[PDB]
Enzyme design. Structure first.
Site, PDB file in Angstrom:
ATOM      1  N   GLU A 149     -10.501   8.020   9.105  1.00 18.22           N
ATOM      2  CA  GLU A 149      -9.426   7.259   8.109  1.00 18.22           C
ATOM      3  C   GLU A 149     -10.714   8.077   7.460  1.00 18.22           C
ATOM      4  OE1 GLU A 149      -8.481   4.511   6.213  1.00 18.22           O
ATOM      5  OE2 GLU A 149      -6.137   5.240   5.946  1.00 18.22           O
TER       6      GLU A 149
ATOM      7  N   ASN B 265       1.159  -0.992   0.316  1.00 16.10           N
ATOM      8  CA  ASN B 265       0.062  -0.122  -0.265  1.00 16.10           C
ATOM      9  C   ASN B 265       1.008   1.531   0.108  1.00 16.10           C
ATOM     10  OD1 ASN B 265      -2.151   1.650   2.560  1.00 16.10           O
ATOM     11  ND2 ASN B 265      -2.376   1.126   0.631  1.00 16.10           N
TER      12      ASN B 265
ATOM     13  N   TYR C 293      -8.292  12.305   0.995  1.00 17.16           N
ATOM     14  CA  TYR C 293      -7.875  11.617   2.169  1.00 17.16           C
ATOM     15  C   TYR C 293      -7.766  12.810   3.851  1.00 17.16           C
ATOM     16  CZ  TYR C 293      -5.187   8.021   4.358  1.00 17.16           C
ATOM     17  OH  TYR C 293      -4.704   7.115   5.319  1.00 17.16           O
TER      18      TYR C 293
ATOM     19  N   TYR D  25     -12.012   9.334   2.579  1.00 19.80           N
ATOM     20  CA  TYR D  25     -12.574   9.604   1.081  1.00 19.80           C
ATOM     21  C   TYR D  25     -12.807   9.963   0.785  1.00 19.80           C
ATOM     22  CZ  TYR D  25      -8.264   5.546   2.054  1.00 19.80           C
ATOM     23  OH  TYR D  25      -7.340   4.142   2.616  1.00 19.80           O
TER      24      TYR D  25
ATOM     25  N   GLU E 243      -3.901   6.488  -3.973  1.00 22.03           N
ATOM     26  CA  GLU E 243      -3.145   5.481  -2.992  1.00 22.03           C
ATOM     27  C   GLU E 243      -3.463   4.326  -4.694  1.00 22.03           C
ATOM     28  OE1 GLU E 243      -5.944   4.736  -0.116  1.00 22.03           O
ATOM     29  OE2 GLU E 243      -4.925   3.161   0.416  1.00 22.03           O
TER      30      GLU E 243
END
Length: 182
Positions: free
Chosen positions: A78, A36, A69, A80, A169
Site C-alpha cells: 500500500e 478510518n 494513494y 502514499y 484519509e
C-alpha cells in the site's frame, strides 16, 4: 484526467461528493470521526505518470493525509505520497528509508509492515511505503516516477499495480477537503 475509478472506503462516515468527468471531489468530516475513511478519484490501474492536483485542505485538528494513494498486487503493498497532513506523521514512527527530492521539496521516506489488516484482498499482511513532503502544500504536480524508482531500491515491486487515486484519509478529529485533479 481520464478518471475511471471512485475510491470509497467508509466514505459514509462523512460527506463525500464527487464528479468523475470533472475530476473533482469534496469530503467534510466536520463532526469528527473515530474510524478510518479513504476517499478520492483515480484510475483502476496505477502508473508512474505525473499527477497534477489542486486542493483546499484543512485538517490541522485531524489525523489525516492528502496523498497519492494506491496498491501493488504482488509483492502486496500500500503506498502514499503525502503532500499535506494533520497531526500525525507516519514516518515519525516507521522504519526510515532515507530521503527523496522531487517537485520542489525533499520527502522523508519510510516503510512499515501491517499484519492481518484490511487490504485489497481482504485481511492480509502487506508492506507500506510512504513519502512525506517536508514542505507541505495543497497544490502542484507529483512526479510519481521519482518516488516509485526510489522505493523500488527497497523492495517496492514497481509493476503489477492495482488502483491509484488522489485521496483524503482521516481516522480521527475533524476537517474538510476539496480537490481537483487536472
Amino acid at each position: 484526467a481520464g478518471i475511471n475509478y471512485v475510491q470509497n472506503y467508509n466514505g459514509n462516515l462523512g460527506d463525500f461528493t464527487y464528479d468523475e468527468s470533472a475530476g473533482t471531489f469534496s469530503m467534510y468530516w466536520e463532526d469528527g470521526v473515530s474510524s478510518n475513511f479513504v476517499v478520492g478519484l483515480g484510475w483502476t490501474t496505477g502508473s508512474s505518470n505525473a499527477i497534477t492536483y489542486s486542493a483546499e485542505y484543512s485538517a490541522s485538528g485531524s489525523s489525516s493525509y492528502l496523498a497519492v494513494y494506491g496498491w501493488v498486487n504482488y509483492p502486496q503493498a500500500e503506498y502514499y505520497i503525502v503532500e499535506d497532513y494533520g497531526d500525525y506523521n507516519p514516518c515519525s514512527s516507521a522504519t526510515s528509508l532515507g530521503t527523496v527530492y522531487s517537485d520542489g521539496s525533499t520527502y522523508q521516506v519510510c516503510t512499515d509492515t501491517r499484519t492481518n489488516e484490511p487490504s485489497i484482498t481482504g485481511t492480509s499482511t502487506f508492506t507500506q511505503y510512504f513519502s512525506v513532503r517536508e514542505s507541505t502544500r495543497t497544490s502542484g504536480t507529483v512526479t510519481v516516477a521519482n518516488h516509485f524508482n526510489f522505493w523500488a531500491q527497497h523492495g517496492f515491486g514497481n509493476s503489477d499495480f492495482n488502483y491509484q487515486v488522489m485521496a483524503v484519509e482521516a481516522w480521527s478529529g475533524a476537517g474538510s477537503a476539496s480537490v481537483t485533479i487536472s
